């Protein structure tokens, strides 16, 4: 009785939200951006190749100096690289080898990693003893850690396979805010440039916009047909892009509360593992399971170029804060640095 | 290259040395992924041989690392294990169809196309008693069991009732039919019949792992 009445109201609310989005969907991004000139062919060469991992590389994260990066591999090694000289600054042995994500603190003093052990371990890179040691082990997630991102040296947001995201206080080791609302495993999260909002992608083919300070979901975005594996904010924070197993990339708008554009091709049938934007946001870079990385014209949904240099699935990619280069990881245990030439 | 760049590059190569040494030690053990249902009894198989439960046992001075995770996403982590130990309860006819669909998802997984499965049809003592009692009929759940006859090439164990042998060969055939339905030889299933007191489970894994590695070498030597 009461349950039957309530579930009908929820369906009405879904129709209310759906009708509102169509009301503001006056035009399409393709119609708006049909006039602008195409970016041409984007040719990026492999400037560096980072060798030294002895298993599949799961995640990589650039440092804010656009020179250092951290990569996580299932050989139990968290390796910090000097991308300019390919030198290995640090090699962090992990207690559990099933690491699935890695984070680099924007200050550069810490790195974080986590996997099937349901722990987000914090490592101190600046110690008086000259070695990297574990500073905090963040326990409390009942599922595998799929993503983690630093806000500062004391705040980190982690997404887990238990369908919940969390905000942690590193000093106390306790989660200040717990984010609930996803019905599937949360696979990725992208912090906004102001670090007050963050979008998360889950296996329920939905992307949720979260308020870090408030602690509740503000908006929900749908349209994907399978699990969302990668999510990335637009440079200005008014939009984001997702990559799912349905071989499509979608550009969702926060204010319009609806999808703006889909990046798909008939030849592409494999899942999408990682997505990132260039410095200006004109180019969308997506890693696929066909071992390639496609460069998309984010405003025109045209494939501008291909980064085909890996012999296994492209598991991750990232763009430096200065936008000079893009690093792509893969299951062939190799990282490549790409940029264009005049 | 400055004076400190050289000392940094020397540090990198020392790190490279310890990375390769740790990889060599990592390859000295064979990694096994343990899977099964709640009623499988895979823990008893582990304990007799002996959120992630890990067990180490040695067979002929060869070390095995078996991971019992306590799933389409995190299963990709075990993309490069030697074998998957899928344990089922053959006595439970009600949940046999759960195992068959569970086995099919693992077998047809896109990231497990080259991983061989060591199937352990556990609890054969319970299966033998259940068939002897006759209270429950496999034909009730599987209609094709009525028209199924034991092949003339079968080799039942000595002193085994033909009713038990017919039931065992049908249960095994259901899993094998899934395995041979697809794969084209990229991976092989290794069914075995174990009980709650069998002490040869570790050696069966060792003998099956040799064939899994041997098939891996034959692809390298041939698929050049």
């Amino acid at each position, epitope marked *: 009785s009461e349950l039957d009445q309530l579930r009908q109201e929820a369906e009405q609310l879904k129709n209310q939200i759906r009708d509102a989005r169509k009301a503001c969907a006056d035009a399409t991004l393709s119609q708006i951006t049909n006039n602008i000139d195409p970016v041409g062919r984007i040719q990026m060469r492999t400037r560096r190749t980072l060798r030294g991992h002895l298993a599949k590389i799961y995640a990589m994260h650039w440092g804010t100096d656009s*020179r250092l990066l951290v990569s996580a591999s299932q050989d139990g090694k968290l390796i910090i690289w000097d991308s300019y000289t390919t030198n290995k600054v640090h090699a962090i042995p992990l207690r559990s080898s099933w690491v699935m994500t890695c984070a680099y603190a924007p200050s*550069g003093n810490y790195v974080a990693c986590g996997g099937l052990d349901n722990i987000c371990s914090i490592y101190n890179l600046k110690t008086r003893e000259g070695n990297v040691r574990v500073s905090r082990e963040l326990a409390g997630h009942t599922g595998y850690l799929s993503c983690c991102r630093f806000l500062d040296d004391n705040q980190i947001v982690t997404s887990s396979g238990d369908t919940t995201c969390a905000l942690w206080d590193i000093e106390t080791g306790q989660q200040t805010t717990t984010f609930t609302g996803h019905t599937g495993d949360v696979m990725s999260l992208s912090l906004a440039p102001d670090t007050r909002l963050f979008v998360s992608g889950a296996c329920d083919a939905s992307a949720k916009l979260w308020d870090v300070r408030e602690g509740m979901c503000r908006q929900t975005f749908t349209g994907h047909e399978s699990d969302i594996n990668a999510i990335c904010f637009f440079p200005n924070g008014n939009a984001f892009a997702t990559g799912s197993d349905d071989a499509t990339c979608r550009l969702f708008d926060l204010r319009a509360d609806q999808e703006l554009m889909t990046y798909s091709h008939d030849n592409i049938i494999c899942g999408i593992t990682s997505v990132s934007f260039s410095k200006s946001g004109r180019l969308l870079l997506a890693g696929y399971d066909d071992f390639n990385c496609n460069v998309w014209d984010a405003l025109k949904a045209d494939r501008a170029g291909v980064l085909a240099g890996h012999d296994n699935r492209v598991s991750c990619l990232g763009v430096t804060d200065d936008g000079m280069a893009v690093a792509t990881g893969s299951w062939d245990s190799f990282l490549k640095i790409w940029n264009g030439s005049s | 290259v400055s004076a400190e760049d050289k*000392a940094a590059a020397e540090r990198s190569k020392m790190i490279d040395k310890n990375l390769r040494e740790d990889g060599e030690k990592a390859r000295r053990t064979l990694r096994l992924l343990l899977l099964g249902a709640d009623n499988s009894g895979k823990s008893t198989i582990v304990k007799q041989m002996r959120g992630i439960f890990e067990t180490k046992f040695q067979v002929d001075k060869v070390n095995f690392h078996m991971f019992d995770v306590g799933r389409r996403k995190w299963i990709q982590c075990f993309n490069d294990v030697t074998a998957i130990i899928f344990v089922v309860d053959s006595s439970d006819y009600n949940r046999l169809q759960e195992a068959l669909n569970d086995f099919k998802s693992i077998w047809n997984n896109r990231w497990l196309r080259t991983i061989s499965v060591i199937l352990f049809l556990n609890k054969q003592d319970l299966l033998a008693e259940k068939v002897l009692a006759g209270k429950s009929k496999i034909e009730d759940y599987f209609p094709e069991f009525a028209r199924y006859t034991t092949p003339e090439d079968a080799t039942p164990e000595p002193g085994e009732d033909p009713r038990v042998t017919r039931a065992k060969y049908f249960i095994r055939k259901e899993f094998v039919d899934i395995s041979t339905a697809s794969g084209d030889g990229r991976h092989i299933c290794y069914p075995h019949f174990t009980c709650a007191v069998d002490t040869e489970n570790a050696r069966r894994i060792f003998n099956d792992c040799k064939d899994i590695i041997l098939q891996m070498n034959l692809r390298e030597y041939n698929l050049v």
Partner: single-chain antibody
Amino acid sequence: VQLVESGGGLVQPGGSRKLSCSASGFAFSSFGMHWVRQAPEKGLEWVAYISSGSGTIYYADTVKGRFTISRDDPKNTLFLQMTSLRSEDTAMYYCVRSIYYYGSSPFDFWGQGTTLTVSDIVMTQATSSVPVTPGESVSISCRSSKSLLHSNGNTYLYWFLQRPGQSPQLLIYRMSNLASGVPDRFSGSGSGTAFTLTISRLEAEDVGVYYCMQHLEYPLTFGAGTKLEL
């Protein structure tokens, strides 16, 4: 972090003496080690350097062929075997650690030092002494014969402060970066062959001798030393 030196003492000319440096409180095997001596009423002089893992060794020309530097990582001890000792070898020998990677701080820690008694790029610090008062900004200048700015963008200049009766302390590394544990009032600036160290709001603890060292290439050469006195 601790570095205790032992084995020094009075020796006859032409003899041999063994210096031991016990390391504790840090990962000794990961740090390259240096020996730096300071002759009585004189400046600092780099002697030898053994890299991490003992794979690389450098010696000063004044000691090459006569001194032997070695480390015992399991025992966390650094050794300096000295042979054919001259009267010029009478000094205080300091055990100095340095780790080299991107963004690291070499020469971050100095040992207490041991007393031994026996019976190239030039760094110029023209002003040996400077009269100073508390609360007043003090600037110290350094010069180099060769341009310390390398092609990789780094300018390898290091600043050290030796308070009277204590070991030298690293202030600035690579000419601009403030060392950990150093008050923010210290600041370094320079370009090419000329560099400056600024000490805003000078205090009593700032009294000491300031040396500028180059790390562009071996051998490592210090400055003459600038003394701040009240």
